[PDB]
């Protein structure tokens, strides 16, 4: 998320925008996922669990 | 004789040399009595990411209906010729004639 | 795989007065031709297992058809194998 600062715009606002962009990307989450190797089976199980949760 | 969508990129300095190349290619497909559907040259376009070191590339689009042999020959030529960087050879279906 | 024109030709060769299109003999012939076509592929691509299974199934079907023909009427069965080059 390459972010540039506009004229007539505060630093805090820019920071907030950057944060939003990051959130949109889901980079941190991806990193977390990749931090340790996941077995395919485990991933599948997780997905299934998520699907189950979705149903309410 | 099968439908073949081919879009290829050429070296920025080799844009002057490609009209001849285009004609050669045309001749090649005419040799095996294949069909040429459309040709669109997008010209020197700034790449989204630079390949090797070049930032601008000469884009050429071409739609063909030809036997396998000439396609293979084309591929070989591409592999050999460093002026044309890479090509996207593709299978298509029915008469595709219109660009843009 | 197998050309439409080729199939038509096969039908013309085998089926009675060309009006028939789903004849048993015709089907057998079609199966045989495709096997022959695919034999080279098999020789080349030795580990292609899914594809192999398909032709095995086809082969089985062909065999079944042949068996059906055999007890139904022998002579026509024999004739079919003669032009085909099928062993038994």
């Amino acid at each position: 998320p390459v972010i540039k600062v506009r004229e007539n715009e505060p630093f805090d606002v820019a920071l907030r925008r950057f944060k939003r962009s990051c959130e949109k990307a889901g980079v941190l989450a991806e990193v977390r996922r990749r931090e340790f190797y996941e077995k395919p089976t485990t991933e599948r199980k997780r997905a299934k669990a998520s699907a189950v949760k979705r149903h309410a | 004789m099968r439908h073949y969508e081919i879009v290829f990129m050429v070296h920025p300095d080799q844009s002057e040399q490609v009209p001849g190349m285009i004609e050669r290619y045309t001749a090649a497909i005419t040799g095996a009595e294949g069909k040429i559907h459309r040709l669109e040259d997008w010209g020197r376009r700034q790449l989204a990411y630079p390949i090797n070191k070049l930032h601008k590339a000469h884009y050429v689009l071409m739609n063909v209906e030809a036997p396998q042999e000439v396609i293979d020959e084309l591929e070989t030529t591409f592999r050999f010729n460093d002026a044309v960087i890479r090509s996207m050879v593709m299978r298509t279906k029915h008469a595709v004639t219109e660009a843009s | 795989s197998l050309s439409t024109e080729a199939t038509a030709k096969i039908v013309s060769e085998f089926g009675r007065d060309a009006n028939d299109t789903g004849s048993t003999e015709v089907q057998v012939a079609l199966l045989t031709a495709q096997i022959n076509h695919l034999q080279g592929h098999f020789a080349e691509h030795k580990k292609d297992h899914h594809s192999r299974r398909g032709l095995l199934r086809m082969v089985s079907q062909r065999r079944k058809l042949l068996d059906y023909l055999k007890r139904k009427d022998v002579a026509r069965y024999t004739q079919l194998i003669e032009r085909l080059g099928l062993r038994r």
Partner: protein, 65 residues
């Protein structure tokens, strides 16, 4: 809401840059069918087109490189 269905097209082409850029984010990452409201085959086609563009360097893999 699927735009492709509304349009009534056979194939989504990699030629049209303006349509494809609407379906990816700024960083160079594809937007899901669940957010956009797209049909699945159409989504797949779109993805393929995007990939083709990336290969041709029409639309980037990553925005920082």
């Amino acid at each position: 809401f699927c735009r492709f269905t509304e349009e009534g097209v056979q194939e989504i082409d990699y030629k049209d840059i303006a349509t494809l850029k609407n379906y990816i984010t700024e960083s160079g990452k594809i937007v899901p069918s669940r957010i956009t409201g797209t049909r699945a085959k159409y989504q797949r086609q779109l993805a393929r087109a995007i990939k083709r563009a990336r290969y041709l360097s029409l639309l980037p893999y990553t925005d920082r490189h």
